[model samples]
Target: GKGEELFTGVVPILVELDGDVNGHKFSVSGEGEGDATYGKLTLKFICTTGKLPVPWPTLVTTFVQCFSRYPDHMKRHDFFKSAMPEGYVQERTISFKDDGNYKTRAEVKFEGDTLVNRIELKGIDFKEDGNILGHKLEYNYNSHNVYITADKQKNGIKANFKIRHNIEDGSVQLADHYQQNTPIGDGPVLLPDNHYLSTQSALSKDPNEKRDHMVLLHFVTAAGITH
Candidate 1:
């Protein structure tokens, strides 16, 4: 590999981080270094973030969105076990409030029976045309896929609010509004569901959301609260 230098100037880079932590993508592969133009950016993720200029061919990409049925009445039998094929895992932190000091302990959790659309960016290369710092540019962009083993859990939520309200009587049992969990795992993306889009218009439509969107959400009801 001989050097055909692309004499350019400073390429002003606008860098941003998009990864599982932000829910924009799953994760990336390598982080080291290689030749500038020869670096092949092999990323597996579903990011709605804008694209970058390239001397490489078209970026063939595909992504879809999904949500597991987070039940209103979660029970002991709610979770058992299941297989995780592959997808970008996401989570939501929801809060359930008992307006009338109900005599029941309010608990928040998920059903965990589904997994999101996966993303793959293959054969992507960054090339430098014989021009050094006399111009502008950027890379080191994140947001990609990842592999989850049995020992580790993707960035998901745990305990929520636990509020205890007193009504001045041994009438009911009211506990603090404890933080709750949800079906915060990857939902299927390969197969398309006509009705799913109809119901999940916001998510299903764009198939991608704002950064950190796949994280916490729905602070109202337990049954897939919109607000």
Candidate 2:
């Protein structure tokens, strides 16, 4: 964080989300980061023609946005030598994916290939200024509209992410990635911690069920680093 930024004093995986699905009007938002661990979340089929809420079949991945990011002078390889609130690979995978053996797991490869461990991965580049080269994700914060996207023709997304700014909406994705906020409407929602979201059930599925409509969300927020 920057000048006088206080730690959010919370656990890891702090985030919240709200979006629609097949006109189901479901939201993964929560009362955790403190919603569930940070906010509120749930899946409600539009045709409640059934249960109003339940868990959605989705997987999550996370990355950290360090403000006073650990000294940039520290090299990635040096991490094996020392430490900081910086570095991407280890923080991205282990902090969120492998710590508990996330269903997807962390550590797929580093120096030799396979593993999100302490070693730096071959495809990634963390420059001294923080501009990443091989972080490998398609995104454009072009003012926060669709700041994040999947691989060409791929339908994959992480459920949440981590931010280290002590200010709300005070985040900047210097690296490539996705987004969830907007000016008028329709984009990633920069939601707060512990916020609950519930969509009014629809009488039927999306009217454009066959259209290329989709529902994807990530818990991206400015908070603390649990390291």
**Candidate 1: 10-residue stretch with minimal lDDT:** 193-202
lDDT of 2 by residue, 1-227 (tens): 21112222332222233323223332332211212222222221221223322122121222122111222222111111121122122222212111111111222121221112221111212232221221222222221211122222221222233321111234333323222211122222122222112111111224554422213232322222222
* Decoy 1 TM-score against native: 0.16
Worst 10-residue lDDT window, candidate 2: 96-105
**Cα lDDT of all candidates, in order?**
0.20, 0.22
Overlapping backbone residue pairs in candidate 2 total 36
The TM-score of candidate 2 is 0.21
Supply candidate 2's per-residue lDDT for 95.
Answer: 23
- Cα lDDT for residue 73, model 1? 36
